[PDB]
Design a protein around this ligand. Structure first.
Ligand SMILES: *[C@@H]1O[C@H](CO)[C@@H](O[C@@H]2O[C@H](CO)[C@@H](O)[C@H](O)[C@H]2NC(C)=O)[C@H](O)[C@H]1NC(C)=O
Ligand SMILES: *[C@@H]1O[C@H](CO)[C@@H](O[C@@H]2O[C@H](CO)[C@@H](O)[C@H](O)[C@H]2NC(C)=O)[C@H](O)[C@H]1NC(C)=O
Ligand SMILES: *[C@@H]1O[C@H](CO)[C@@H](O)[C@H](O)[C@H]1NC(C)=O
Ligand SMILES: *[C@@H]1O[C@H](CO)[C@@H](O)[C@H](O)[C@H]1NC(C)=O
Ligand SMILES: *[C@@H]1O[C@H](CO)[C@@H](O)[C@H](O)[C@H]1NC(C)=O
Ligand SMILES: *[C@@H]1O[C@H](CO)[C@@H](O)[C@H](O)[C@H]1NC(C)=O
Ligand SMILES: *[C@@H]1O[C@H](CO)[C@@H](O)[C@H](O)[C@H]1NC(C)=O
Ligand SMILES: *[C@@H]1O[C@H](CO)[C@@H](O)[C@H](O)[C@H]1NC(C)=O
Ligand SMILES: *[C@@H]1O[C@H](CO)[C@@H](O)[C@H](O)[C@H]1NC(C)=O
Ligand SMILES: *[C@@H]1O[C@H](CO)[C@@H](O)[C@H](O)[C@H]1NC(C)=O
Ligand SMILES: *[C@@H]1O[C@H](CO)[C@@H](O)[C@H](O)[C@H]1NC(C)=O
Ligand SMILES: *[C@@H]1O[C@H](CO)[C@@H](O)[C@H](O)[C@H]1NC(C)=O
Ligand SMILES: *[C@@H]1O[C@H](CO)[C@@H](O)[C@H](O)[C@H]1NC(C)=O
Lengths: 148, 371, 49, 49, 50, 193, 197, 197, 50, 49
């Protein structure tokens, strides 16, 4: 363990713990901080809708979309910064890990385009948050065996 | 029903003046049944047992303010710091009386250390007044130390924010060395001849000894320092004709303590208006029951606006220090401290004395090489 | 100036693989048609025109 | 530009002329000078002007 | 993790020079740190092709 | 006088008086009401900022400008809505009855153009409030026996805080006041057919 | 009948006289012309004043002439407030302005300054309309100064329900309060009763 | 030694012990582990913790990873804040993200809810950084609850000095309060003193 | 001092009409009061000259 | 539509001179060159063409 000390008495590699408050008044261990990197268990941010008693929340709107180039441009995030440039919006995509299991992860990527600008201007006017991700089952959708 | 006031003090005359201020506080402050008691602790050679005597003699006494008035200690560290930490254990304002150092004036290390004497950062206000009046803009900052020096440079930047100016050269380093001559000779070959210096006493003696090696006693020089830099061997090593500063009623001890205790008692009677009576309990036996009006009575220290005092108009600023302090401006006329100015408010009033400069004329040296 | 403007980000992807050190090297490279455009102030370019 | 029919024609394109620039008039020693200057030069650096 | 100035501005802010008399492109960040005069030339950006 | 009544028995055209509370802590008559419309003695609306003694701050700015057709378009109020349209900002003009009389009134008008958007974006960024008003003294500026006219005289005599409007810069104007960084390439020019 | 006091029901007493004597009765000023809500076909009584709807029309004209397009409506449980709110909503619905209007915040009881504090902290706008009696307007303005809602950028426009006597001005009234009343001192009492005759 | 309570000045007392006994002293837990301003050059006192700069780096890394970019910054006059704001300003100066920063909202005293209320009402953004003591944090969060600044879009990321002991979670805290500390219950005190030995 | 509508909308809101099967141009404010179906014809605006 | 947009306001102060009841009267007025242009939809003017 690199337990070295600085000139003003600090651990060079300490163990930071990032916590949130649950609905039952306890601090849950969420994110440990490494040497340089930040290990985060929740890539998707958990909402915790009732921060207090009088909170009806109707503005965490989940939005799914499809990669269609003239309206939806989906690109990789810059690995040098890990930051979407501000003309784009964040998104995530469920990517399967293996062919054997249905388990996958959520790779965060960037989205620009025309409908992205429509969604941003709706957020400008109607003042609502938005949860953007991608579809993996079908592209447009079709009633197959009465299952959409 | 009583208010116990404790202090760290030795002399019997100032204890008598403290009890005299206790007697004067019960005269014109109404007919309420509050009383006052006095407690003053004296010298101990060991510095830990100083704060030990303070804690077991004043926490059990439930004091409300702590004042330390000891210049003549042979240890030149000047540490009432564990006493201020003991008062900060239940958020009690420590009313300083002697020191002015920025490492003691810092609100971070010293959370509730307020006093009626201005720190050495307000010497930059006098330097800014000299730059305004005598129309000087080519300055060089030279501080040998680093504890007070960072706060002094921060205050210099704060006061040069108004003119939107910057210093041509700033120097902070390790004292004790003799070969500081390179930076000084390169500052000679610059275009600023107004040199600002403020450091420790022996460090002032060292740089004044280095000034003799570098022919820094010629013409065009503008020197203006504090009170530490004109005493001891630094007084002998200084070039004659140098302009210095002095606090009016600085070493005055009886009337200064009397005015401070008057501010204390009238602040207690200000706190008695809006009631909320909280008391620091006996923390000596297993108690961490914190004092609720810690900042709030500190607000009383922040809003202690008065105008009665032998030292002058006592009033605390946003830094918790003296607003618009009384200053004298001295001249070392051939190894003789000659008073060549007084100060009120925000304005220097030069008297009818003679100002002999270390260089040429008797008026202001505007020795600028015009680029 | 092109790094601040985020809508000009795409051209910012190009010049980082293509920039030079002096404009005279750029004039020499565009004379040999190694360049194809050159974002520059108008005085030098009209003087070389 | 608003000449109906491109009839009245200018001379040159800013070559043999006085070549000054419009500014914002402030009082001497006003504290708002540097802030307005930085705000204007920020307003140039996005194509909004 | 500190940004410093290079080039002509890195040489000026190091005190090696006293005044820049050069085709200096006036923009936002240069005015944030040093003072300016009024510009002697007025022009913008364009494209050179063959 | 038409002091007629309604089915609710109220007066059709009553007498309305709009009073204020000034810094002298007494009521002061300001607004009068005509048969249908409002008339204001103080069409210039000042701050009345001293509500009590705890107000040291300052954010309003007295700003003068001048009519130039590609930069400051000055129009009347919109007669359909009695309201300036959303890009236009209010202003006033000190219009007299004729040339022989010396007293005039500050009639409210609307402004748009180039410098108006500049001032609005500055009030976005610098986060201040502003009071737009024209000048009736005349042109930009001309020294008439050490007295400037138009906007420059209003800046020198300090009845105008700043002149954000369109203004040429030369040597003597740079002597008497201080300017900003330039923002538009405006030399001189000659027009022929 | 004329009056210089603040007893409005005397005019209502005249209204009862107007319910019985079948005589047209005119009220000049004071309590003789303070606005009652709904008259009667059995009555022939009349006042010399302006209704709260016409006074609200004048106040909205004032707010339109300075382009103060954002406001908040604050009333107490003093009666007449429902007609006040409904008239303001129907006037904004018939307004070319497009008023960026923060909603209406009222009170419930004598304030504990616990829930009414939360109700008053909702305002971050500038112009506030206030319709309440004089005995509680001082409390509202003192609470707004205690909450900093009497700022330099803020504004306060009230009807004549609070602005009664010219002499009685407490310290809590901010210097810059605009009120509207029909007490026109430019017209004398003799001119008013001559116009009535 | 590791403290169990929330008194940081105890460690400062221990700091004075490290100025006098010439013994390397390790602050471990609680108020003995809380970060003070400037350790003395003659002192040999060392704490098992991080800097305020590294913890601000962690918090801004959280904000970068979760894309919360438009934020504010609120501190009291509890010291150690100027270097914190300076580190945030240099981090914005060293940012390829393009952060948006509402200006610094300071507090004059322990708040009267008169002048600081207008300063808090200037905020209409999403994420607010709060830096003060724990009781002052309870007071400011109760004020923001009264101001309605504890909603779904209204997040609060606080340093470890706000949190303090994990064994005590006081009232008026939003269920979803984001904190960054190092008082891990899994990272045991026995492992702390074993690593120190 | 009251806003009204005239024409087909003025006859619609007054109960004189109940369905407008007509070339009505869908814009913002006319949708702000009543409901619109999905448009059967898509076009824009242009200029007629000789 | 022309009353809303702020960059088309001046034409709105000009087109308020000759407001016509029916489009047939507009066709009749442009038919004898009493007008010079007319603002109308696409397919109606294509049918009239
Ligand atoms: C504080 O300074 C004052 C002078 O400003 C001095 O007080 C003198 O005290 C003596 C008695 O010790 C009196 O006889 C004098 O009358 C006082 N001075 C004057 C000129 O009035 C003294 O130096 C300091 N205070 C004390 C009493 O020590
Ligand atoms: C009441 O004042 C108005 C002016 O504010 C006068 O109304 C005029 O009447 C005509 C009738 O078509 C309207 O077009 C205008 O509103 C007014 N004339 C103008 C200025 O164009 C009216 O004359 C006044 N009442 C009396 C009795 O004089
Ligand atoms: C940081 O730690 C991880 C996991 O131990 C390791 O893979 C990585 O190489 C380290 N990075 C550094 C600072 O070299
Ligand atoms: C599943 O994982 C194995 C791991 O080696 C990999 O070889 C294989 O390609 C994966 N399946 C697919 C189709 O990616
Ligand atoms: C692996 O993926 C392929 C498509 O690449 C699919 O044809 C196949 O069914 C998968 N493996 C299994 C489950 O047999
Ligand atoms: C009051 O002060 C005296 C002298 O300092 C001290 O002996 C005593 O204990 C104090 N307390 C009381 C009993 O008031
Ligand atoms: C360094 O200091 C010594 C002692 O004062 C002196 O003799 C020597 O000349 C100095 N060196 C320089 C660089 O002048
Ligand atoms: C100082 O002056 C003396 C006399 O002119 C000279 O001998 C000496 O070299 C000077 N010192 C320096 C290096 O400036
Ligand atoms: C005293 O302070 C408490 C909070 O500690 C507060 O509840 C109370 O109202 C104050 N009393 C007064 C009004 O003096
Ligand atoms: C400071 O200056 C005056 C000058 O006469 C002096 O009498 C007094 O001691 C002080 N008064 C104030 C204003 O503090
Ligand atoms: C010093 O004295 C004068 C009175 O002569 C007084 O107005 C003020 O306190 C001081 N001067 C200033 C303005 O600083
Ligand atoms: C003042 O003289 C001008 C000259 O053009 C004239 O147009 C105007 O009517 C006169 N004054 C006014 C404002 O009536
Ligand atoms: C003002 O001047 C105009 C001509 O500009 C004239 O017709 C008028 O009678 C004068 N006075 C009045 C009554 O406006």
């Amino acid at each position: 363990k690199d337990l070295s000390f600085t000139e003003e008495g600090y651990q060079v590699h300490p163990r930071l713990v990032v916590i949130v408050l649950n609905k039952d008044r306890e601090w849950e261990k969420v994110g440990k901080w490494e040497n340089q990197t930040l290990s985060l268990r929740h890539a998707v941010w958990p909402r915790y809708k009732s921060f207090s008693d009088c909170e009806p929340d109707d503005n965490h709107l989940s939005i799914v979309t499809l990669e269609e180039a003239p309206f939806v441009i989906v690109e990789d995030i810059d690995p040098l910064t890990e930051t979407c440039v501000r003309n784009t919006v964040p998104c995530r995509k469920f990517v399967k890990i293996n062919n054997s299991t249905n388990e996958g992860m959520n790779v965060k990527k960037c989205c620009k385009g025309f409908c992205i600008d429509i969604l941003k201007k709706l957020s400008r006017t109607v003042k609502f948050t938005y949860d953007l991700y991608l579809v993996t089952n079908g592209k447009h959708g079709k009633k197959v065996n009465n299952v959409w | 029903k009583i208010v116990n006031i404790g202090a760290v003090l030795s002399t019997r005359k100032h204890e008598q003046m403290f009890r005299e201020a206790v007697n004067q506080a019960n005269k014109r402050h109404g007919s309420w049944k509050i009383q006052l008691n006095a407690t003053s602790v004296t010298h101990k050679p060991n510095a830990i047992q100083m704060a030990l005597s303070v804690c077991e003699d004043l926490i059990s006494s439930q004091v409300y303010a702590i004042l330390v008035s000891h210049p003549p200690t042979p240890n030149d560290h000047f540490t009432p710091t564990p006493v201020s930490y003991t008062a900060g254990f239940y958020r009690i304002p420590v009313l300083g009386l002697t020191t002015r150092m920025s490492i003691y004036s810092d609100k971070s290390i010293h959370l509730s250390f307020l006093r009626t004497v201005p720190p050495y950062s307000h010497q930059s206000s006098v330097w800014f007044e000299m730059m305004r009046v005598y129309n000087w803009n080519h300055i060089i900052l030279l501080v040998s130390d680093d504890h007070e020096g960072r706060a002094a440079q921060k205050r210099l930047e704060t006061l040069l924010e108004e003119r939107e100016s910057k210093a041509e050269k700033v120097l902070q380093f390790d004292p004790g060395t003799k070969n500081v001559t390179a930076l000084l000779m390169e500052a000679r070959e610059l275009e600023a001849r107004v040199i600002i210096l403020s450091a420790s006493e022996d460090d002032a003696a060292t740089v004044y000894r280095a000034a003799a090696m570098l022919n820094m006693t010629g013409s065009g020089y503008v020197w203006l320092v504090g009170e530490r830099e004109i005493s001891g061997n630094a007084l002998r090593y200084a070039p004659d004709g140098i302009i210095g500063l002095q606090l009016i009623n600085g070493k005055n001890e009886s009337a200064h303590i009397s005015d401070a205790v008057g501010v204390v008692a009238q602040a207690v009677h200000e706190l008695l208006e809006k009631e909320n009576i909280t008391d620091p309990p006996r923390g000596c036996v297993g108690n961490t029951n914190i004092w609720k009006t810690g900042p709030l009575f500190k607000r009383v220290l922040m809003s202690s606006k008065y105008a009665d005092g032998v030292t002058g108009r006592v009033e605390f600023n946003e830094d918790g220090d003296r607003k618009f302090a009384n200053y004298s401006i001295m001249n070392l006329q051939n190894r003789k401290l000659v008073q060549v100015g007084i100060y009120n408010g925000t304005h220097v009033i030069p008297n009818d004395r003679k100002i002999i400069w270390p260089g040429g004329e008797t008026e202001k040296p505007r020795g600028y090489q015009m680029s | 100036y092109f790094r601040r403007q985020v809508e000009l980000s795409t051209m910012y992807r190009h010049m980082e693989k293509h920039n030079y050190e002096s404009a005279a090297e750029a004039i020499q490279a565009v004379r040999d048609n190694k360049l194809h455009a050159f974002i520059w102030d108008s005085a030098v370019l009209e003087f070389e025109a | 530009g608003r000449d109906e029919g491109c009839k009245l024609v200018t001379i040159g394109s800013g070559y043999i002329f006085a070549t000054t620039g419009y500014g914002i008039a402030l009082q001497k020693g006003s504290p708002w000078k540097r802030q307005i200057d930085l705000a204007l030069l920020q307003f140039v650096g996005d194509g909004e002007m | 993790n500190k940004k410093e100035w290079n080039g002509m501005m890195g040489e000026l802010l190091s005190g090696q020079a006293d005044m820049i008399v050069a085709p200096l492109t006036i923009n936002n960040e240069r005015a944030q740190y040093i003072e300016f005069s009024k510009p002697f030339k007025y022009q913008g950006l364009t494209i050179l092709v063959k | 006088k038409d002091l007629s009544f309604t089915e609710e028995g109220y007066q059709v055209h009553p007498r309305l008086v709009v009073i204020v509370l000034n810094k002298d802590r007494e009521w002061e008559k300001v607004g009068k009401w005509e048969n249908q419309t409002l008339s204001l003695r103080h069409a210039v609306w000042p701050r009345y900022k001293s509500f009590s003694d705890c107000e040291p701050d300052d954010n309003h700015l007295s700003i003068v400008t001048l009519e130039e057709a590609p930069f400051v378009i000055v129009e009347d109020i919109d007669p359909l809505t009695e309201t300036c349209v959303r890009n236009t900002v209010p202003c006033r003009k000190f219009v007299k009855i004729n040339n022989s009389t010396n007293e005039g009134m500050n009639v409210k008008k609307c402004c748009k153009g180039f410098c108006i958007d500049i001032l609005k974006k500055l009030s976005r960024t610098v986060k201040f409030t502003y009071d737009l008003y024209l000048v009736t003294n005349g042109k930009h500026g001309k020294k008439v026996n050490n007295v400037w006219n138009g906007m420059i005289g209003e800046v020198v005599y300090q009845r105008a805080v700043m002149a954000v409007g369109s203004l040429t810069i030369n040597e003597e104007r740079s002597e008497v006041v201080d300017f900003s960084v330039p923002f538009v390439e405006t030399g001189i020019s000659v027009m022929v057919s | 009948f004329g009056d210089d006091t603040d007893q409005e029901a005397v005019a209502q007493m005249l209204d009862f006289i107007s319910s019985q004597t079948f005589i047209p009765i005119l009220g000049i000023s004071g309590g003789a012309s303070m606005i009652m809500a709904d008259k009667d076909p059995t009555s022939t009584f009349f006042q010399f004043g302006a209704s709260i709807q016409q006074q609200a029309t004048v106040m909205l004209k004032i707010m339109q002439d300075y382009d103060w397009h954002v406001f908040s409506l604050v009333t107490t449980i003093f009666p007449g407030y429902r007609d006040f709110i409904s008239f303001i909503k129907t006037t904004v619905d018939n307004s070319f302005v497009g008023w960026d209007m923060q909603n209406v915040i009222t009170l419930d009881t004598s304030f504990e300054d616990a829930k009414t504090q939360v109700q008053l902290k909702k305002i971050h706008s500038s112009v506030i309309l206030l319709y309440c009696s004089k005995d509680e307007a001082v409390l509202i303005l003192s609470e707004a100064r205690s909450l900093g809602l009497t700022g330099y950028d803020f504004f306060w426009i009230v009807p004549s329900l609070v602005s009664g006597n010219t002499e009685l001005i407490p310290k809590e009234f901010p210097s810059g309060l605009i009120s509207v009343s029909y007490d026109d001192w430019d017209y004398s009492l003799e001119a008013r009763v001559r116009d009535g005759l | 030694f590791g403290d169990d309570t929330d008194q940081e000045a105890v460690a400062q007392m221990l700091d004075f012990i490290s100025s006098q006994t010439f013994i390397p002293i390790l602050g471990i837990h609680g108020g003995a582990s809380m970060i003070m301003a400037d350790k003395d050059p003659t002192s040999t006192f060392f704490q098992f913790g991080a800097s305020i700069q590294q913890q601000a780096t962690v918090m801004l890394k959280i904000m970068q990873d979760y894309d919360w970019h438009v934020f504010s910054l609120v501190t009291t006059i509890f010291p150690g804040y100027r270097d914190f704001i300076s580190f945030i300003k240099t981090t914005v100066d060293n940012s390829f993200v393009g952060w948006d920063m509402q200006n610094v909202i300071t507090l004059d005293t322990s708040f009267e809810d008169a002048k600081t209320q207008v300063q808090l009402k200037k905020i209409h953004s999403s994420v607010i950084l709060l830096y003060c003591s724990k009781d002052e944090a309870v007071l400011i969060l109760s004020e923001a609850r009264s101001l309605g600044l504890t909603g779904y879009d209204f997040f609060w990321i606080v340093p470890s000095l706000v949190s303090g002991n994990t064994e005590l979670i006081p009232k008026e805290f939003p269920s979803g309060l984001i904190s960054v500390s190092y008082d891990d219950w899994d990272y045991s005190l026995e492992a702390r003193v074993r690593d120190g030995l």
